[model samples]
Target chain A: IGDGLSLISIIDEVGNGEYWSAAGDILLFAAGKTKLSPYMTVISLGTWMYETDLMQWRLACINYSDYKKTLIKYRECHKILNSHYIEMQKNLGNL
Target chain B: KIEEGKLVIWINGDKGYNGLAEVGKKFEKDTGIKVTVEHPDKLEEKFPQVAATGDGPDIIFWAHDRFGGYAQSGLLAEITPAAAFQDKLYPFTWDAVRYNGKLIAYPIAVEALSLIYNKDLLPNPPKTWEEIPALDKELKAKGKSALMFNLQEPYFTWPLIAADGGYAFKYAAGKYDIKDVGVDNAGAKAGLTFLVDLIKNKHMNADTDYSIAEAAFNKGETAMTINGPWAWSNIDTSAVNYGVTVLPTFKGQPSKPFVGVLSAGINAASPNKELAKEFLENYLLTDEGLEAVNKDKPLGAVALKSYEEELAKDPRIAATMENAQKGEIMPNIPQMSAFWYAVRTAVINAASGRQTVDEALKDAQTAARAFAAAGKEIEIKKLPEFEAMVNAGNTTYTGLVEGIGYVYWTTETLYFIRTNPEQLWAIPKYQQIPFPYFQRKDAIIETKTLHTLHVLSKDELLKLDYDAYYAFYGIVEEMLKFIHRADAIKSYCEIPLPIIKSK
Candidate 1:
């Protein structure tokens, strides 16, 4: 009734965050030295809470404009991590 | 103290109740009450986090600085002592129990830092700091330290600074002349450096946390140790002959430690308020009662003068009481909270030699002011917003017990995840995520969660945590590799991924 247009948008952005972080942990592990930004563990758990049994209703807390903005912040951090991994791989030339 | 509506008292550390447990028998017989005591290692976080939050204990006992934080938060019940009850406490014992003009606790015992040493090892415990240094060399030759302590914590260094006249607050009349500070370079830094030098010379270990310090002298490992009365129960009398005395004078003056009391406080919300009052005030406060509680020794000093007179005759009690003679009675005011936090890390850093004496003292002064400005962190609300990340998906492998819980692992995070059966719903196109989410950037993300609709009996479909899978990689002489349970999971004697492939 209030903001139907954006509720699904929130899940789409945050829903896959935990999944994405786990994937990116290995991707960047292939990169040397430095560790993941730790933001991955920080924000991923909240998104997971929304998906679990009995905790599903909590997902709606994410259905806001600011929530989506923070979602983008995670994505951007993800964006830099992938960039770092690629840069580390280039020097190695092959795996 | 009627024994019927069983009393639960939360005590910090093991309260050497070997005697109280026996004496409580008579109290239980006369009063018809069953008293239960629970000891926890630390009470700072224990009280607010779980104890005082909702189902707090009927009686809580601990140090002065901590009691104020809980009391001011409206968690403690006000103690309306009889006119005679008020008179029982030592003149100095009143400082911490009085918060905003009302008494909140029964002042039971006081703690002041003292030398607890093996008498046979150091016949004359060094009387001055300058006289203590070479004892390290002398004792180390005998595979012992004449003196030893973990100084990586500030509380350990307090008696040192206090003894050396390094005042945290200049107490005039009732208040700690708060703005008039003296911890750094106020003659306490010498005491702090003295503590650190024990470590700097490799005489004490950096990892000597409370567990090690408590076990050290009692194990006959160190010749002498510095500690407070709360730690006395940890002494193994059978193994070592231990003796007690006040801290040695430093730089020609006593380096006194702050004195603290273990007081009994009633929970504000106890249903049996009248019973709690009767038990604590009448039975627990009496000479017969305190004698029973003290068991083998006086529980520090019973505030009553008659029992107090008889208690000092027990040389053990006399030594502890004598040690606290000149020590500052811990202030109960909430402002003392600021003083503890400010100097805590500051003193530790200096004592551990991570910071110079000057750096630690200066930093401590800065922290004290900031803490006073920041006040204390208290939350009235019981619950904060509930949010936690869901550990998504895992590669579920059901291993069997046929010498064959063989696990196959490839990636760094073969250490993956598992969650409930439904991460998402099954209705109107409700998918947690598409299979497309798994294959990303031409690579597969390894994660899964399993909800069992197990058609198989518990034996066949999976190997539980009881299973162990070891993997070896070798091209030359085999190296013993370490298993990093780095969140790694597998099936069938789980396969190992080479963090570094054996070349």
Candidate 2:
């Protein structure tokens, strides 16, 4: 039922057109968010995940999942500060 | 409807702009987007007006000084960190964009003033203020003054004051403190006195204007002058060997010039705020973009931390960068509007010998105080009292008149008057005057006789005019002898006379 609802939303957004052929539908399912997730996770972990040494032989990984979640939650704060500075320089010509 | 295409950016024709535009085009072409660039003629006029009206271009270039005014006026859009893309920029260069705890502009270039001299004339420029006066004297003895500075412009004079440990505004606690204006500071006074002595002793030409001084230096007529990188193009190295050095200092401290920064700012109300941020981020903050900007319009870049390496190959750029480190940000307080004019007035008065250094300074301080007080809505009752003192006596009146005459003389209007040689007239407009006479002319009587007889004294004249036995012709001969003696002195001194020399 959830799958059927998602398909209905996509069809409503994209509209029924000649580009939506049966073969194209099969290709779209193969290239959807499901296929992109694992690759995206690997890239994110390499750049954003924090790590710590657990023991002599074991490597302990400190997850940045919470920090990433918080950054997304408070993203507007960073936006406001950045915009303030950009505008300040425009007006005064100096920082 | 959604469309994917190229973006157009307009920039000034300056080197930095061209460099950024090139980078923009490269980014666009790589991303399958079209980037068109346009250069405008008047960035100063066009940019601010556009920003104020909320009809600005996608991105615009400006200097740091305009940041305070624009930020306060809400002309610039507040940029988000995500939008700023701060990771690519050097921390210091980004600092110029921050104002009042917020970043409002993107830093582009930094510039400062320095002493540029002719290598042929001054093989070694004096590094200290004390050394300058003596070196100047030596140069003057050879019939060439070592330096030329403008008294009419504060840009030249302010640096000299700063070298002496003076500052226009003092920063204290979290705000600018006005009580600490260094115009009357001991060090500034010393600098002003030094300049006056230089002029009086003929170490520097007191009458040389900014253009004449620059022309003279380029033509190899003058040895040195304090200038900035803006003058680099105008200097003709082929005509005269030249080089630049860090400005000299007073007591081991270099004269700190006001560092000027050119920066880019995003408009707060820009319809394309996201695109503007992306453009600024990709084109202005990137290493390639910075290199391009520096190469094309070479003002020292504020972003590049390795200024020594980045500009080391360009000596002129390097000197400007070195000076920038020692420079102070110019005051942006609105009250400072009155300072430049007052200081220039004092400098001109001192240069023309109309006021002593102390008197000129006192006048400037008084004017500044009045301006500050007026801004704060304080009653300026003391000004009237001061004016009364300045206008109190004949000596004061004479000084004022001579000051006016000097203004006329400098403007080349001193030939307007013609007077009779034998007559002592209050005004010089008398007809039948083949020759002009000055107040100090010999016909005024000898200083000794004038003192003894009080010839112009109303009380003494009353006594003599009533005394029937008093010899009128005797008084006339005394006055005539005084006039002849004055003429002899004028001729001996080679002073320019209003009368044409007889054949």
Candidate 3:
């Protein structure tokens, strides 16, 4: 499912839109940045709105973006400590 | 018009924000003004956006370097520091927060790079860079790297070349000539060449990043590393016996590291500007408020001169302050963003042998110029009052009320000349000498009295007596440097001033 380009590209183009609609709408309302109306749309996707999964996804995005900015601006090519990086490594496993 | 009794602050991390929250609680109890503190992700980007809609926090707490862009973008409120508050903090702290000759933020904590070494490995720290090669050879046999740092990062490596006169931009008369990029200059090249030699000879690794270097040092695998106070959190101080000291000399001159100051600035669009200013000046700047904040995370070097004694008790903090006095303040211009990106590429290319050092730096300089072509160009313009006096051949100024001091204004700098050197301790309105657009020499006291306080520009002082000026400059510098330290002040008081052989 994540083949042609980097997973970041695929997520940027497709997965984010789906994730934002399915889960972010609820989180934003919970944080009081959005109105109660859009949260109704999140209630419709009951199975997709798994609290733990959505929270992990959110944390991963924040860590990944922070790591990327540090790398680009500082040239600090340290080992990635984000969940997404850990998961990617888990898939390959032997290295 | 809006809600009356509330203030909001947006800071980046939880570690220090809780301290602010503690201060907030006390503030609410005393003044009936509720304080809300939030740690939002991507605050550097998020703040500007939320601020555009006029829904941003009242205060933004970050490093002084970042506020240049905020002030430039009109996202910050200008602060007018009262006369009493001016000398309360270190003079250099004010330099860090000002943008285009206005106070954009209030300085709180000061930070700079220092050479950290394993005390067990090297009991005495090296005083010169020449000592590194021999130490590296010995350490290599023992399966350890003698020295390692974030080699590609300009912030870390800048000191390596800084003593050799490498700078991102030329600073003079209190302004940076952004158009004049100095990364490719002779001195910078010499420093870069030293790094390339170490990498090519396998004495150091080109791939040693922050994590790797820090980990190696903590594990006792590396004998020495370069880092700041924040690294103390990641370091296993229990396992490794470590000591912090100033960076070793290069080419017989001490390396000048970049100094950064953490600061707080009010948002321009906030409706509670008066309340925000009151809280910052009253609570955040006070001893009790700062102490509460320092409890959460130790402020190694404080910008506030009042807290110097308490912080000076720690050996690490003492070393940091000593090194900081010798360091140069980091440029707080919007153009600095481009400088970082460009210098990083140059350091990596040169060290990895992807390009020649000169070619790499040349390309990087060109890239930096192109990247910063948007705006914020600076030019020197003489003040009309000063220009008229100079044209009239008036060397001595008596414009101000008689007997305080004579004012001398050059196109380059302004000076307060006092004839009675004994009265040098306090010059009236010294902190409030209006024009700061040009570089300022605090004062020039000329007198034949014993224990005179003499401050003169280098060129003018040199013309009088080179030997006497050199000795006076060095001794006076050490005295001036320890203005924050109570003990140093007492010791220096008994010492005699160097006698100038001029008149």
Candidate 4:
């Protein structure tokens, strides 16, 4: 708690299940662990632990402090992930 | 892989399942296969990953904009509907779900964003954005805004942004050139500036969102709002004597909202492909089947030409159908991910005073260009606050819909690295600076906890510092392997092309 890094907050306790990005990219889900940024663009699959009803699924204009800036950052994150995926494949000699 | 006795279908949204559920009973009566209609949350996000393993629902019903990714990724099965069936549906509906000269999904309903107005307050809608100033004066006297919308959202503001020849991507010959992102161009900049000025002039509310805007219109707080058929149920419940029509023009030219076609696509990996095709052909495509969906929720406009007349009897549906004619079908391409991300950022940044219209649009162009050039080498720009904005002890999470996903923002950050298990990817080490007090010009988000996902190999983990290792968790190699295999299949599957007609 005293560390400079804040606790990675999430809509719910992300579990070790499966997740796919809003763009339909696959993501690994980890439960009770905080290795993922709450800002990352992935949704939980299977059972809905988070209340999807109350959640503001599409309130971009109102919710984000700076959605404009964050959206660009998200693209960067996506690029990083995609590049990493390619790099992993290259390491595996699959490319 | 065929589960012969039962057929399962997944539809989006919690509403409208009852209509389809009831329609399924008739399907079961005709054929012995019991039909199950389940509305799954996050259907779009989950279907590609699950269906790639040949385990998703036989049929998935959702907006047609997703058809491209599903079709290109080889997730959807190509079906040959009879020419009679194809001709029976409105020709324009094909514009959305068709990919690579092939129809990837069967269109059911059509919708476009339109100007929804309180008829009691404003008997006749203003025809152009210029007319809004006069209306604003009148409305302001009564303590109401002339118009209000989710100001920062591009979906609602695209009509304005594209009013002066603005476009998300250059589309021609049925393909989109991702390299040609048009949000930052002069025409779009002009449109964006107009939208920003609306906030400056107090004609619209910067703080109001979709929910707030809808509520305001229903309460007669605002004269007009921009929304779609999906909002019909809520508006009907509120007793807002509302009238729907095409959006107001920007200058002399009409501004077009993105048209979305709601459709159904069969999973390519499903064993019951034949049965799924028959289900769409014999049951769901018919007027009776579509009528149930409309009854569950007004479809706004039906795709079946035969039913359009009946649906158009409702003036709201009629206006939406009319508006759909003037709108552009939202491009269904893999690159749209970049377009949407960039444009939303441009709109929000400009409208919120975070960035000027030119700066925001240029930055958007740069970000989108990088995304379009993903595989190629390109220099990714770092955000201005990359090092300065650290964990300031205050955080807030804003849960948004699919386009931008969820955004959790805080004052500053710690040099924390993260990873993803699905692809076995990791965010390389980056430095971060701490800010003791981070103040925001606008209090858009309040506070929340932050969770970051990181993945790594045993060797990499061993090399991590004590603090870095402590920050990392959820290390499981087995889970990563399972995800990687499914992902590889989805990404590498071959897509069938060319239109085919059922005999």
lDDT per residue (tens digit) for residues B1-503 in model 1: 22337677777665645555454466578788766777766655676666445565677877766776677677788888887777776767766576655677878777777888898888778887777778878987887776666555666767777776677666654344445557776577777777777667777666677667767777777888888776676675445778888778888877566777778888776665666787777777778777777765547755666677788786666766666666777755555556777687776677556889888888777555433322343111111110011122222322211222222112122222222234475311111222223333433334332211111112221211110011111100011111212221221134564577667
Q: What is the interface RMSD of each candidate, in Å?
A: 17.4, 51.3, 34.9, 16.8
Per-residue lDDT tens digits for candidate 2, residues B144-229, read 76777555787687777777666766643223444345666677677778777778876776687888788778777778888877
What lDDT tens digits, residue by residue, belong to model 3 across residues A29-95?
Answer: 2111211122332232121122223334445565666666766755634555454466544433422
- List the TM values for chain B, per candidate: 0.61, 0.66, 0.72, 0.72
Runs with alpha carbons beyond 4 Å of true place in candidate 4: A1-95, B375-503
Q: Pick the lDDT winner.
A: 3
lDDT of 4 at B415: 18
Task: Give candidate 2 regions above 4 Å deviation.
Answer: A1-95, B1-15, B31-41, B80-96, B141-143, B172-180, B369-503
Task: Write down the C-alpha DockQ for each prediction.
Answer: 0.03, 0.00, 0.01, 0.05
Which candidate would rank higher by DockQ, 2 or 4? 4
For residues B399-444, what per-residue lDDT tens digits would candidate 4 score against the true structure?
Answer: 2212222222322121111223233454321111111213243322
For A1-95, candidate 4 gives per-residue lDDT tens digits of 12222223333333343333323443423333434443341222111111121122212223343444545677575555555444444434421
TM-scores of the candidates in the order shown: 0.53, 0.57, 0.61, 0.62
Per-residue C-alpha lDDT of model 1 across residues A1-95, encoded as one tens digit per residue: 12211011111111222233333333212212122223322222212111122122222332233345655767665545455445444423421
Poorest stretch of ten by lDDT in candidate 4 chain B: B466-475
**lDDT minimum window of 10 residues, candidate 2 chain B:** B406-415
- Ranking of candidates on lDDT, top first: 3, 4, 1, 2
